């Protein structure tokens, strides 16, 4: 019957590893590098678009940075189509919580929910896992500014600074070197761009090959503003930091 053709996506290897999860992580390692850096007064999200074209309409394009709600955003690394499935689920979960409790969802709760969905695909259903790794950048009134990451296994962890996708080993070493606890957003912006500029496989880092975003309390009085950077605004911050 049909058993003959079943790949069995949710089994252990003799070493106690999940085949499909490991192979999904291998896929993600070829995706464009995404970086998240958390500062005292905000969070930075920086990401590299993969080998673009001059004929790509950049100003209406979005492959890396997505908005989950007004307080929380994510950077993507892996299959974009897979990520959008999860992103729409996450957007709904945040709205369910808001409807139930009349309060914005705490960042960790949203992260745990998406991470639990990913876990399910590794334990039951016989389906392939989502080939996606997220960097969550968000704010709430309990823990303040927070950075998380999740991967196809459904495991998630918190970070001060973190990278996903390609060249994470090199990127993480550079972040570990220059990161300090009393750092500010403007400094973190510079660190994020400098790290991408050194780890990139491209010849030079330009505005058309980047997506950038900040989450600042730099909003008029006690509140939080999300800023998805425009192409011209990425070009300006590249000149300001002295990369172009």
């Amino acid at each position: 019957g049909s058993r003959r053709y079943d790949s069995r996506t949710t089994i252990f290897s003799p070493e106690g590893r999940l085949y499909q999860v490991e192979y999904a992580l291998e896929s993600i390692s070829h995706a464009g590098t995404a970086i998240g850096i958390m500062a005292s007064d905000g969070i930075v999200l920086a990401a590299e678009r993969k080998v673009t074209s001059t004929l790509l309409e950049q100003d209406t394009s979005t492959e890396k940075l997505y908005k989950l709600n007004d307080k929380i955003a994510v950077a993507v690394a892996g299959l974009t189509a897979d990520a959008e499935i999860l992103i729409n689920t996450a957007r709904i979960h945040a709205q369910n919580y808001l409807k139930t409790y009349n309060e914005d969802i705490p960042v960790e709760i949203l992260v745990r929910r998406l991470s639990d969905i990913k876990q399910g695909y590794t334990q039951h259903g016989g389906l392939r896992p989502f080939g996606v790794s997220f960097i969550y950048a968000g704010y709430d009134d309990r823990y303040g500014y927070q950075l998380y990451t999740s991967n196809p296994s459904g495991n998630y962890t918190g970070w001060k600074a973190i990278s996903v996708g390609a060249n994470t080993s090199a990127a993480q070493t550079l972040l570990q070197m220059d990161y300090k606890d009393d750092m500010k957003v403007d400094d973190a912006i510079e660190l994020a761009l400098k790290t991408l500029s050194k780890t990139t496989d491209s010849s030079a880092l330009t505005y058309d090959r980047l997506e950038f975003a900040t989450i600042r309390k730099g909003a008029n009085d006690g509140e939080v503003y999300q800023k998805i950077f425009k192409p011209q605004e990425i070009k300006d911050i590249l000149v300001k930091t002295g990369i172009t």
């Binding site: 058993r3 079943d6 069995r8 949710t10 089994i11 252990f12 290897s13 003799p14 070493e15 106690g16 590893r17 958390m38 960790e108 745990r112 991470s115 639990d116 990913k118 876990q119 590794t122 334990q123 039951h124 259903g125 016989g126 389906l127 823990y143 927070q146 950075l147 998380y148 296994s153 459904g154 495991n155 998630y156 962890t157 918190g158 970070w159 001060k160 600074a161 973190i162 993480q172 972040l175 570990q176 990161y179």
Partner: protein, 240 residues
């Protein structure tokens, strides 16, 4: 629905999927449990390969199931959340119907039953997780410490360890733990738990987590400095 039998017997009478789930536990960070005369202590290893971590928000290794029971684990982290969630739901369900919190044995029996169910259900793989469940029964001052594993078997332990290099720390506990006279105080019990982890951990900095559970829902997690004082005193006595 996906009905495929993933956990099945082999010619030599082994269920490889359950056995490979134990290998995932072997890979996981070390966890240890020691019960004294009037307390239980849960020690856990944090691998220092991950720095630049945010320890405020990172999921802690020891999880409260109820105000009087805790659960630590070794193995797949994502899998452990599912068992913890089910256990927490069952704990509140027990309070709701029986009008009494769960006994540590009951909660262990439930978690163990879930693990077993995943070894002979279609379309699912076993949990790659072993747990240490510790606490005190309601209105009882006798310490309780139980262990579970992917197959679904469970049992009570005077002291026990699970995870990577658990063979070494179990060796330590077997010679150092006396049944006729267990750690009489909190200090003695914590000291013995930190000592056992120091056989395996590497550095005694942010790599050791300790959680003390006392009777009547008295649970507290020790800080870095408090643990560091135990690490200092142990090695100074060792220099002799």
């Amino acid at each position: 629905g996906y009905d495929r039998a993933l956990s099945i017997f082999s010619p030599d009478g082994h269920i490889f999927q359950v056995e490979y789930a134990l290998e995932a536990v072997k890979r996981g960070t070390c966890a240890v449990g020691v019960k004294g005369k009037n307390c239980v202590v849960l020690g856990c290893e944090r691998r220092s390969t991950l720095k630049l971590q945010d320890t405020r928000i990172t999921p802690s290794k020891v999880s409260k199931i109820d105000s009087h029971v805790v659960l630590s684990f070794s193995g797949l982290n994502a899998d452990s959340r599912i068992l913890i969630e089910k256990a927490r739901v069952e704990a509140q369900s027990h309070r709701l119907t029986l009008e009494d919190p769960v006994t540590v044995e009951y909660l262990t029996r439930y978690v163990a039953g879930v693990q077993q169910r995943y070894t002979q259900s279609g379309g699912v793989r076993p949990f790659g997780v072993s747990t240490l469940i510790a606490g005190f029964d309601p209105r009882d001052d006798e310490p309780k410490l139980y262990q579970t594993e992917p197959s679904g078997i469970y049992s009570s332990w005077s002291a026990q360890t699970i995870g990577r290099n658990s063979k070494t720390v179990r060796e330590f506990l077997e010679k150092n733990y006396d049944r006729k006279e267990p750690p009489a105080t909190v200090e003695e019990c914590v000291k013995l738990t930190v000592r056992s982890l120091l056989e395996v951990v590497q550095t005694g900095a942010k790599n050791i987590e300790i959680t003390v559970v006392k009777p009547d829902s008295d649970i507290v997690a020790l800080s870095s400095e408090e643990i560091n004082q135990y690490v200092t005193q142990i090695e100074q006595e060792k220099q002799e």
